[PDB]
Amino acid sequence: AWPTHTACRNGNLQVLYQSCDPLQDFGFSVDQCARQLKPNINIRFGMVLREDIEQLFLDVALFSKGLSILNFSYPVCEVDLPKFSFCGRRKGEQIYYAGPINNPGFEIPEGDYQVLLELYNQDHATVACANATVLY
Amino acid sequence: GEAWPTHTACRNGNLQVLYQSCDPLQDFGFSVDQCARQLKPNINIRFGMVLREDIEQLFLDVALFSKGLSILNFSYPVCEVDLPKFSFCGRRKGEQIYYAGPINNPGFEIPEGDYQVLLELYNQDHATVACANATVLY
Amino acid sequence: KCTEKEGNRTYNCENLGLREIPDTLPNTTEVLEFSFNFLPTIQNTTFSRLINLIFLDLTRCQINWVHEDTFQSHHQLNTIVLTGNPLIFMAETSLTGPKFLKHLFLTQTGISNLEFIPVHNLENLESLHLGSNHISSINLPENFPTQNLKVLDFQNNAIHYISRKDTNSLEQATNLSLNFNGNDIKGIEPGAFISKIFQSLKFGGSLNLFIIFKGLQNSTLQSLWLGTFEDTDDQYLTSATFEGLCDMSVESINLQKHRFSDLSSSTFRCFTRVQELDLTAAHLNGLPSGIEGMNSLKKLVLNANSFDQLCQINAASFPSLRDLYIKGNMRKLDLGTRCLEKLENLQKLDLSHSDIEASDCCNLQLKNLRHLQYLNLSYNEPLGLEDQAFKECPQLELLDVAFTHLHVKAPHSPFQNLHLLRVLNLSHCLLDTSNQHLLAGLQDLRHLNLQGNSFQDGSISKTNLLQMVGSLEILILSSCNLLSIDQQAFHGLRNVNHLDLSHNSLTGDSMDALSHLKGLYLNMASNNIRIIPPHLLPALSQQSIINLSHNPLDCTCSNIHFITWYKENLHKLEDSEETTCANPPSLRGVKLSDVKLHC
Amino acid sequence: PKCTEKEGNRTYNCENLGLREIPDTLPNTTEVLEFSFNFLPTIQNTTFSRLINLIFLDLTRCQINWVHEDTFQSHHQLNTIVLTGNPLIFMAETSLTGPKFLKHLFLTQTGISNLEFIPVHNLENLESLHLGSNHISSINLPENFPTQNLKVLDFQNNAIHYISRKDTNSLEQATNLSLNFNGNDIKGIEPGAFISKIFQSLKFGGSLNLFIIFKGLQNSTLQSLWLGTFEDTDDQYLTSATFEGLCDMSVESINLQKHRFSDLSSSTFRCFTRVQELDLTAAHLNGLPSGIEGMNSLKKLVLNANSFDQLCQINAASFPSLRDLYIKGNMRKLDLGTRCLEKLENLQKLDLSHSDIEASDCCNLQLKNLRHLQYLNLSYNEPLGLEDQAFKECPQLELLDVAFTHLHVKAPHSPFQNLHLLRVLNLSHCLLDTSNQHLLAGLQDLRHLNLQGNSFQDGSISKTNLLQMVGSLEILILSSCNLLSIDQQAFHGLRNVNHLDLSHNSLTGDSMDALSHLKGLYLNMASNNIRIIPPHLLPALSQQSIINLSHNPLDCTCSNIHFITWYKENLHKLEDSEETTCANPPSLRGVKLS
């Protein structure tokens, strides 16, 4: 299986992830690691696309002690609204993004959690998959 | 295993120039734009390769044959530490190059018949940068 | 192994790490998806076996060399995709061969000099894709064919200036569209686009629109995309910004995601000849009143903004408007009353996902919209529809309120007046299906979606609301937790041909209700069908396509008649691969196709 | 399969071997690893852990995609990391932390378009950062990017079109910083961007508008400015107008190679008044204008590769303070004239090589008045006719080089006679006539002579010869002269030598007699016809420091037994041992004499 990378490490806080796309790994990092996540945080991302992303969606499922908690879906790129400069890139293009995502602020209650993140396009093709662990 | 494939540098009429790479490590892409008996001065070429040696210093050796007899040998520097003649001089080992521009040749009415030319680019430590076993056919 | 995506004509070989074309692949192959394989060198020999290719995708195959005559034997090649290859050199005749090569993708191939592209056989090109390269001048080489060029994509490159000299290169083209998205354009020589040959231009993410407009002086464009992105650096549009616009003509402008510094009616001084305006996610809390410079607008898009009352758009400004989109509003949108009253010619209105919630809907809230054909109120907070709630919409043709809870007092008929209405989507509206007069008025409706609502006792009776929409062709009743459908439930439905009962809990006897129908698409996937009694087996055989997938189907002798039927009619059966036995344990998981029983 | 031990247990070369991992062969003690052209898609903490003492690591063109966290944690002495030519997808934040003093990082042609890609964590000790041939368009560094010790910053062949004051302010923490912009098409520079005194040297090679550049560099102090162009670069034309911006700045050294001067007047150099070095190489010059006044304080002028007809056309009057003058590679018959450099009283270096010079009564009038000249280079020229006392008028000369320029000297003339301070003389392939005993008369104090490629009567150096007239020599090169023998008492009278090169002749073991009176030299006898080394003169070899007997048909019978035990005993003292092998007998032909 793919290696477990460290998205970040401030103090006792740290966020680990590993790619659950069997075809490839990818590179991800967050810039400030804090309990109090500011809004409009900055990320870094490095990957080669295996699908066109004119339409691109994010699914997030959050887990605690193997049972589940919150599920949502948000669109990143839509035909009538590319939110990001990288929208509408083609399958086969390499990407490096270093910039903001538009997250509202939120805390994270203390506790060890596993988050499962999935980026996919309109045909439900996998663009990227992270099995992530947040450690308090 | 197999030797490198013979590419066509050009083909105008009955004239044509073929070449094959004699660097065992790799091929390279070359083409001349106008193919004529009368070679104009300052002709334009096209070239594609990955460098395996630094070319701050770079020299060209040309040996020409015909009826398998030796009719001329010369050496000309392409890049020198005190004179980089081309924009690509001083590139590092490992850099990919694409050059599409002039070289500073002079005239040359190509005489009738057939010609075997051996071209060798090398640096100051005699390391191979590029090697062509070329055939000229009229 | 590759995948036969279509009989002998299309195959997928992606991510297989192949170093050569398989002997498996037949002469008759026309579409080959060959991404993520390993072809360092490409030659005359590489694709010779496959002489009839129409579409060839070599994305990300590590190609370094494309040697001479590679495609000589490939007369019908239409599209070549080379995206993501570290190309070192392409021979002069490397793409000659095809008689009508219309699309070449050279995206992210490392190109910084356009002289690198072999021109020999490009005169039939309709689209050339050069995005994410290392390019800094759109100036094409001399003697580069551009006559049939209709799309030319230059995204994410290093183009900082466009000159008259540069654009003149493209003079042979006709109706050409260019994409410059993600190039930081610092200047354009004025008049570079005077040529009438330019249909559409995109300058996405550009940090100085004044510069752009000034450059496009005296030009005619179908559309101009000047939208920005989240990640793009912060600017602020002004009335000043658009001064250059009234020395040019564009039918369609997009200004997505921008911030208007001091929005006045004066800001739109030069929008007088614009026909479509898109202000999506422009941080608007309203529009100014009395514009006068959107007098000839036909299409306005105000999606993803922050309005509080609908009237704040000041509709007075755009009398000639045909289509209005206010989808995805970011806070409770109060529709008000008589707010769109002035928009007498409106035909499309999308209010979906805009956190709207209305009380006595919708005659007042849709006052005077005599000619509306499409209304979308889906994904909203609850709506109370009165009797005849669209009486002020007699020409409505498609109504969509999916995922918007409807509150209707039995026995009101909310859609009575809508006699020209053919498509109605009430999915997940939590409709009270008791009200036999819910769907009154809709004798001539053609397409009804009642997905994810619910019927008393989990059953559709002899008597029921569908007896008011008799002329239907498409009926969707999926996810309604139906346990049963009465034998006569759908007598009265004269013209059905698409029936979706999937994701309920129906059993085989429920197929009785279908006996009087012929040649439908019948979807019964994900139900609780086990044994299909033989007497009502001809009900299945009377149809065109059947889906019985994801059912706990029975594979004992008690279901023998159904199993021989299924094998006999395999061709008529959709989603066959996922139609498998539950009983007995030995055959659990076995596809029905493969069941071998003896009785 | 196998790497090469380039130096004992410390340097190895593993290039082009397609390795997917570090070999177990490679030892703990490795400090320099050249690992180009291998296959390391991913790089990790485990990749280089066996090799804990690396100082220099070259991973060029290894198809690296990923450089994962803590890769170099255990590599405290890493000085240089070379990543050129790898398709990098992502580098972890701590991927280069570990080394205590990482001084050089090469990220050339690695696909970088956003400088945020480079992990800053452990870069504060960087002395050089190489970012050429990437997809970069702004030299603006990220905030909190260390620049204090940055001394070289290479931005070649990128897509940089504008440089702003904001951009350059990023680099304010640097001191004596040098930047290379060669091959970027610079369309504008915000004026004053380089007012900061921290900038030592800038290169703007191939740039198509020098007016724009100079205007940008207004009010700046630079050591040097490289504004040369190339063959392939598009055609411009320099004017007096072009350089107007130059006299609102200060630069010691300017290069304008390969340019074309539209209307060269003395007015063209109005703003060169504080320039100390000017290089006009291959500038299509047929001369220089007279009476410049604006190269009054020049010390170094380079006019190489031009097209002069007469030397006087350079109008030397213009540059009295000149020290070094280079006119190498002239493209047509250069006539030296007479008294032409007479005004250049302080000249110290003069290079006239490869300029197709055919002097004939040389060189007192050609070199009139050049009293302080120390270095003269007339190599690779057509024949010179050297006067008796050829160089009276250049007396304080120190190094004279005429290699490959046929000297015509009518015996018994002494052309070098006045050159009392000459310490290095190169007459290689000059086609001398060594028969003249007086050819080197007056060179009693010379310390280094090169007579390579000349001939001798009978191919033999007798008791009496021209070398007992240069009695002091330390370095003597007599290679590739076709010598069959040297007389026993031929080098007596030279009692100083410490470097003797007799290689590439047909000398034999009995020629070693001539060395008996000497001690501790570097003795190169490679490529001769030595077979048996007689034992009585074996101590002549043992008296020396380094010996090279390689490429000799050395004898490996019992008749050479004494020499074979000597050679094994003294292996350490023997240079090029690997290529020193037997000729006889057939059984041992090719065997290393070890």
Ligand SMILES: *[C@@H]1O[C@H](CO)[C@@H](O[C@@H]2O[C@H](CO)[C@@H](O[C@@H]3O[C@H](CO[C@H]4O[C@H](CO[C@H]5O[C@H](CO)[C@@H](O)[C@H](O)[C@@H]5O[C@H]5O[C@H](CO)[C@@H](O)[C@H](O)[C@@H]5O)[C@@H](O)[C@H](O[C@H]5O[C@H](CO)[C@@H](O)[C@H](O)[C@@H]5O)[C@@H]4O)[C@@H](O)[C@H](O[C@H]4O[C@H](CO)[C@@H](O)[C@H](O)[C@@H]4O)[C@@H]3O)[C@H](O)[C@H]2NC(C)=O)[C@H](O)[C@H]1NC(C)=O
């Ligand atoms: C009237 O207007 C409505 C409302 O806009 C239109 O609704 C559209 O309907 C079409 C057709 O049914 C849908 O198309 C299909 O889309 C999927 C991908 O769907 C993904 O998005 C879903 C919706 O996301 C928004 O809404 C959800 C629900 O509230 C919300 O939670 C999300 O966060 C998101 O939020 C919005 O925020 C703003 C609010 O102001 C919006 O405006 C903004 O735009 C944001 O949308 C989402 O639910 C879904 O996730 C679910 O499903 C996935 C699927 O696996 C699952 O993973 C999750 O767990 C969830 O269960 C997705 O993320 C697409 O894949 C389909 O593609 C199929 O068909 C196409 C062609 O049709 C083929 O190319 C393919 O082969 C494939 O088979 C399909 O395109 C669309 O989703 C929907 N749009 C919106 C915005 O809701 C309606 O069409 C209009 N009517 C008419 C007549 O035009």
Ligand SMILES: *[C@@H]1O[C@H](CO)[C@@H](O[C@@H]2O[C@H](CO)[C@@H](O[C@@H]3O[C@H](CO[C@H]4O[C@H](CO[C@H]5O[C@H](CO)[C@@H](O)[C@H](O)[C@@H]5O[C@H]5O[C@H](CO)[C@@H](O)[C@H](O)[C@@H]5O)[C@@H](O)[C@H](O[C@H]5O[C@H](CO)[C@@H](O)[C@H](O)[C@@H]5O)[C@@H]4O)[C@@H](O)[C@H](O[C@H]4O[C@H](CO)[C@@H](O)[C@H](O)[C@@H]4O)[C@@H]3O)[C@H](O)[C@H]2NC(C)=O)[C@H](O)[C@H]1NC(C)=O
């Ligand atoms: C005084 O000035 C003279 C004259 O310029 C200086 O001469 C220099 O001397 C140094 C030291 O000996 C030489 O350095 C070594 O160079 C080799 C590479 O040599 C290559 O170039 C050779 C010369 O080329 C020009 O001249 C020849 C001969 O006429 C001509 O045919 C060529 O065409 C070329 O022409 C010139 O055109 C113009 C004429 O107007 C010139 O101005 C212009 O500059 C052009 O030069 C060339 O002969 C040689 O080819 C021969 O040898 C190769 C070797 O295999 C063989 O393949 C061929 O078949 C030929 O037989 C080469 O192309 C370099 O490899 C050496 O590197 C070693 O040493 C260095 C450090 O010293 C180490 O890094 C390495 O480990 C390595 O071991 C070495 O640097 C130099 O060649 C020469 N320069 C010139 C221009 O001649 C002299 O140095 C000055 N004196 C003092 C005291 O400073």
Ligand SMILES: *[C@@H]1O[C@H](CO)[C@@H](O[C@@H]2O[C@H](CO)[C@@H](O[C@@H]3O[C@H](CO)[C@@H](O)[C@H](O)[C@@H]3O)[C@H](O)[C@H]2NC(C)=O)[C@H](O)[C@H]1NC(C)=O
């Ligand atoms: C409620 O059901 C209706 C009826 O099926 C759904 O309408 C469908 O909406 C989709 C997409 O919104 C339309 O598809 C589009 O077709 C056009 C034209 O060919 C094409 O350009 C687009 O790419 C897209 O595929 C579809 O035409 C339309 N169906 C009908 C019959 O009009 C509607 O989506 C449902 N609502 C929700 C919220 O799901």
Ligand SMILES: *[C@@H]1O[C@H](CO)[C@@H](O[C@@H]2O[C@H](CO)[C@@H](O[C@@H]3O[C@H](CO)[C@@H](O)[C@H](O)[C@@H]3O)[C@H](O)[C@H]2NC(C)=O)[C@H](O)[C@H]1NC(C)=O
């Ligand atoms: C004739 O013989 C002389 C004597 O050796 C040769 O002189 C040598 O010239 C070379 C190169 O031109 C000098 O090498 C240089 O050294 C400097 C300083 O360390 C370094 O910066 C350069 O990279 C280069 O290696 C060398 O110093 C010089 N030797 C001496 C003793 O001065 C000369 O080149 C010979 N002529 C010909 C045509 O071969």
